[PDB]
């Protein structure tokens, strides 16, 4: 409730209270494995191919990304989130008075290429950058040159200087000198000149003293970062302030590839290439990967790697997220054309509700039209992305996985054995002349079919958004409130309306609201409801009976 | 019962007993620091930003009281209390006969320039005062020169002279003469003659004398304060009554920035700065800095220091006025980026249930735009602000804080821990996109959560404000009235009408009115009520059971 | 009954007596064992996962760590005591003027690399802390250098010197000379000054001395803390008060690996490892480790050795704490495939209701994916965990261990003869295609199975909760009150309160009210009441009857 005014006043007024209530999940996936580009134990929220490619160069990494989103064509792109598993560094050159940092990490930033020239009739520097991985070359034209000073008076000889700060290294102020004593001085620190814009047009306003802003774009550097220049004479011909680092930054600050920092005296150095790019030893562990997915929001996590270490690690991230109140689930799958009884012990040693393994590997046909035959767990993306783009509480079951081909075609009697191991498969169905693959149970590893929620993936997952989403929204409303009388009442409205929308977008059966019950008694408030869980048809059970009918006339 | 007429009369009449019965908190904050500006030891009462920045010019004070405000943008901006711990003293100059004073205490007064001159056209003096700091520069023109006396009779010569009282230094007569002979006088000593207005217009009266108020401004001067003249002559050329002292007191007794004393003879002096000011050396303890707050009507109260003696006086402060009957409370933070073994050894110094220590310190933006890093005191000056302006009962649990950035984001363990202490920490929260900062918990340094009156903030202030306000209203309305039969019915009605309107504020949760019991029994009146206090939610149960249903048609 | 006000007074007022009545286990784990990390016989309390790791870096204790909460997925994860068995001692190397000592006990503190290097730019230490073990190397650059001090007076020289007490080698004064007589000093005792800061303040107040603070940090060091400095000229450059010593413990008092004391000169010292990391020989005994727990409030401790002595002392311990009312129980396992022989021995040596003996030993799968094979006594930690996460009273009898296999699997003639001699055995369950592993029984080693409570850890757990709880709560509500007539009265309804509760959490079958009878007389306050304690089921007998039935039409 704003009140109008906000100002008490105790003269007589009008006062109007404003009360703004009653006009006031994306399930996003997750990605790990090897890449040519980003940044280290960073994770970039993805929302188009485009964007992953121009981050991520190439590898195993990007065509995950790419299957993950061809695997759904009839559902919505949910985000992605990727990692570069890889301890890249960047390349780097010293050389000259600035060190050359490359944004690229990895061997390829090793090809890119950095010069100055220095141009004569201007008296500027030019920057020139070649990139021929990326058909990248610009040239970086009239590096510094920000201004011009001239003087029109008829005294023998006018000059100007700059003084830095000592401990700093920064201009300070700006002494416009005729003769021998000074006319005027401009101070640098702060304030009135905090930019070299309202320097020049002090300038102008003297009647001696003239200036110009370059023509060479509208750069305003800052007045701290202009060089130090002593007794240089105006009246024989116009000088320029120089400025070649402060220059340097608002070009490529936020610009090109390769970034700049001083060490020093900038000068022109020829065109050498960049050193220093290393994507380093592959992580002996996953762990410390896994931790900067804890709040970023994700769900299903598919782990771009066959070994078992690595399946366990993230089998114990999940499970240590959903204690904290941000559940997860995980699909993994197991190498190239592994039997069942190597799939036998895969699911064995995990045993986890949380984690899905996938049997079947296979052939995808990419956008750059490549039969690149992957590993089981590049399937896994297909379902993980799959899932992601299903509503809350949608299985995978008997979906289509679109897939050129399978290593291996399991029979009637393999399916079943897998199914009953808790073990995802795909078949090959036959049974038509438009034939295709289905996946035809989403069960988890956890073999204990009497609970459906660990058992099943879209019965466990619509508990936990339920769950989750009714944990934060309590807390965001209720908590730090009045204990008011109609505070019950209010609870209780507030969670038939929340079950209203479940239902109302299917993601529970149903549930009796007489059975809502709140029970408030000091800081605790007890909560009791009972709900119909949403379920996924497994079995159909029809009983065909046969009867004789007479007819007459 | 006020009657009519008020005098008695026997004779036969009419009287008419008029009754007009039938007819007939604000939770103020306080704040004790440094600033550049107001009177030392004395408290002022704020309720705009641009009146603290006159008073108070800078420093620290002044920016808590603009966070104060900003942290709760929806509610009310209520009054400020504060006060300059700065044992400030005034610049002076004796120069001339005047005593130069500064009403600016600090260091700030000494740039002040106070000087006079003399218009030899006009005969008056000219003060000018420029303080270049403010910007103020202002000339006091015609100083003196009030009236004029003109005689235009046809004897040789008229003259008058002023007769001043020798203890008081006080002008008493203003005799006219004409020749030798005295015509009329005028006594000055008080009654008919107590402003300068009464003489002009008596001496217009009169057939030669004639006289004219100064068209400069509307003086008014008192006939006290004229100054001594004696034989000057009026035929000749009209005289001016100059009364230097006066005017000066007029025009700058509740204007400008500089007042003046008498010490001697005023004369004209050269342009020169005030000095004295010493903001002086900070006071040992805060002790008797804070008595000034103890019948200002606060509840609130922040030190901005850091110091554990300083926390310790505060703490002893605010126990001192509840035991009074004027409860307080106090909200302190230790430093720049304490740790928690730190902060566990300032909870265990207090101790203090009125207490509340803040761990979290981070950087605001302020008006001004600067991205001020402010230690964990000032974060309570939010607090404390925010819980100013919530409604009483009400708590800071989960509200938000509306901070840029803390030096130190605490994971939910160290939440957990810091809680457990009764110190009082601010979470980063990262389960949404739009993540914002919010309040964990409102507890108090007295770690024993039985009892949540002294536990919890809310639920003791509360308790203070009920047991405050039925204090003071139950003294003023039966205390000194007649022991009536139906005085313990009039009391039991008073009573459910107070409770009443708190359950209409939702101040309390709800009363039985049956059990309120008056007994009264000569001087005493044995009073018993019962109420179910007001609190907040801090823990809310939900037991969700799923459960299976049938379908059929 | 807390009055108001607190000071009475005799004037007429009203009085309010404000009473807060009316309004107002855990069962821990313990672990002890091998670990390269932590304190010596020191207790840390454990919530999580990475606190352990981070603490203890690795060894058995940290997997018992991760076994206990792995062993109990749907209950809740209780809190950890753990402690270091090894008696380790903190690296330290000793050169230069600082004593260097290493927060890490063990061989692992002996990487530990610490260097000093003066920076010539800014006449600054650099403090360089490498660790490769955990990938740490940062650089605490700019240590000293607090703030400058500058003077701008027409004088010919200017100087400051700092005086220290000979007895504590502490900074006294700080005074600022002008010429040869001094100008002003500031005592550095206490009081106005105890921080630097007041004293920047007050030297900037001054009209020629200037000061500001350094941009690196807020250091805000204390005055005592500054370094000896006399005879400084201060005009012809800014004179930095360096205070090393100090600079550096503000850093590093909680943050960081590295400790540092003053022995002596600091001056730089090349990068130079670290010695005296011992993790030293193994105790002798473990009973002065197990004294640590003693008032740590746990229930459940499993010894991490596989001795019988060390069983022993366990034995004797939980027995000596139950004897001062702090009853423990405790958990071990023999060896590695120890036959039923074997087992009988350590069970008959030990014959203590409060231990119990795990014979099996199995491979559990890790969080990292290592099919670790581990002893009987490590199985216990399984056991131990479920049953700490367990409510109070409930068995661990026919619950699912989650352990991938077993060395050894009883037949069930074999199991019997365990049971029989009071010795826990898990089974492998082949009656179903989902097979799964299950506690025989939680029997204790105490074969006597005619007295439940001490043949049964589930029933005895719930008597010594049960017994503990009345214990202190009787002692903080009712000692020290007065025998009022209602005394009797009261402590029956406390009671009844007291067991409702119990009957409400299932804590106990249920109690008759009547014969809870209450005897006051004198200081002796005799209780007596009834119990009926809860049990878990472990026989289920069925009579089927088969009868004829006849049917017609």
């Known amino acids: 409730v704003e009140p109008f005014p906000r100002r008490p006043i ?27 580009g980003g940044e280290p134990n960073t994770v970039y929220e993805l929302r188009n191919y485009s964007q992953a490619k121009r981050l991520f160069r190439s590898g195993e990494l990007l065509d995950a990304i790419e299957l993950a989103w061809g695997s759904n064509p009839n559902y919505t792109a949910g985000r992605i989130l990727a990692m570069r598993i890889e301890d890249a560094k960047p390349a780097s050159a010293e050389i000259g008075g600035l060190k050359i940092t490359s944004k690229i990490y990895g061997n390829v930033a090793n090809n890119i290429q950095v010069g100055l020239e220095k141009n004569t009739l201007s008296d500027s520097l030019r920057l020139r950058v070649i990139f021929q991985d990326d058909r990248f070359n610009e040239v970086y034209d009239n590096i510094g040159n920000i201004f011009t000073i001239k003087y029109k008076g008829e005294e023998a000889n006018a000059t ?38 309202a320097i020049i047009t002090d300038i102008n306003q003297l009647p001696d003293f003239e200036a110009k802003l ?23 011909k116009a000088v320029y302030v120089k400025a070649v680092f402060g220059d340097l930054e608002k070009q490529t600050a936020y610009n090109g590839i390769v970034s700049f920092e001083q060490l020093k005296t900038i000068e022109p150095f020829e065109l050498t290439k960049l050193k220093g790019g290393t994507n380093g030893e592959p992580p002996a562990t996953w762990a410390d990967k896994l931790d900067k997915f804890a709040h970023e929001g994700g769900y299903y996590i598919v782990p771009l790697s066959s070994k078992q270490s690595v399946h366990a690690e993230v089998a ?104 009953e191991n ?132």
Chains 1, 2, 3 share one sequence.
């Open 10 to 36: 105790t003269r007589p007024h009008a006062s109007i209270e404003v009360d703004t209530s009653g006009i006031g999940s994306e399930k996003v996936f997750c990605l790990i494995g090897q890449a040519e």
């Open 160 to 197: 100007f200087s700059v003084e830095h700060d000592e401990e700093t290294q920064k201009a300070s102020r700006l002494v416009l000198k005729v003769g021998d004593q000074e006319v005027k001085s401009y101070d640098l620190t702060g304030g009135a000149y905090d930019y070299t814009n």
């Open 214 to 236: 370059s023509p060479f774009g509208d750069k305003n550097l800052e007045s701290s970062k202009l060089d130090k220049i002593e007794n240089a004479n105006i009246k024989d």
């Open 316 to 419: 114990s991230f999940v499970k240590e997220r959903s204690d904290a109140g941000e559940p997860m689930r995980a699909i993994v799958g197991g190498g190239f054309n592994e039997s069942k009884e190597q799939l036998f012990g895969r699911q064995a040693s995990l045993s986890n509700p949380r984690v899905s393994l996938v049997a079947n590997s296979g052939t995808f046909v990419m956008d750059d039209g490549r039969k690149n035959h992957v590993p089981a767990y590049m399937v896994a993306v297909a379902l993980g992305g799959l899932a992601s783009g299903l509503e809350i509480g949608e299985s995978i079951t008997f979906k289509p996985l679109r897939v050129s081909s399978l290593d291996q075609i399991y029979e009637s009697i393999d399916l079943d054995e897998l199914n």
């Open 422 to 553: 808790g073990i995802i498969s795909i078949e090959f169905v036959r049974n038509r002349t438009n034939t295709f693959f289905r996946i035809v149970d989403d069960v988890t590893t956890f073999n204990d079919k009497s609970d459906p929620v660990k058992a099943e993936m879209a019965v466990g997952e619509a508990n936990d958004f339920l769950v989750s989403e009714l944990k934060v929204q309590l807390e965001d409303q209720f908590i730090g409130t009045r204990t008011i009388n109609t505070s019950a009442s209010i609870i209780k409205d507030f969670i038939q309306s929340y079950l209203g929308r479940k239902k109302r977008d299917n993601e529970i059966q149903d549930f009796p609201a007489e059975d809502v019950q709140v029970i408030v008694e000091g800081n605790e408030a007890r909560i009791s409801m009972t709900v119909y869980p949403i379920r996924s048809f497994k079995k159909i059970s029809v009983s065909l009976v046969y009867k004789q009918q007479t007819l007459q006339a």
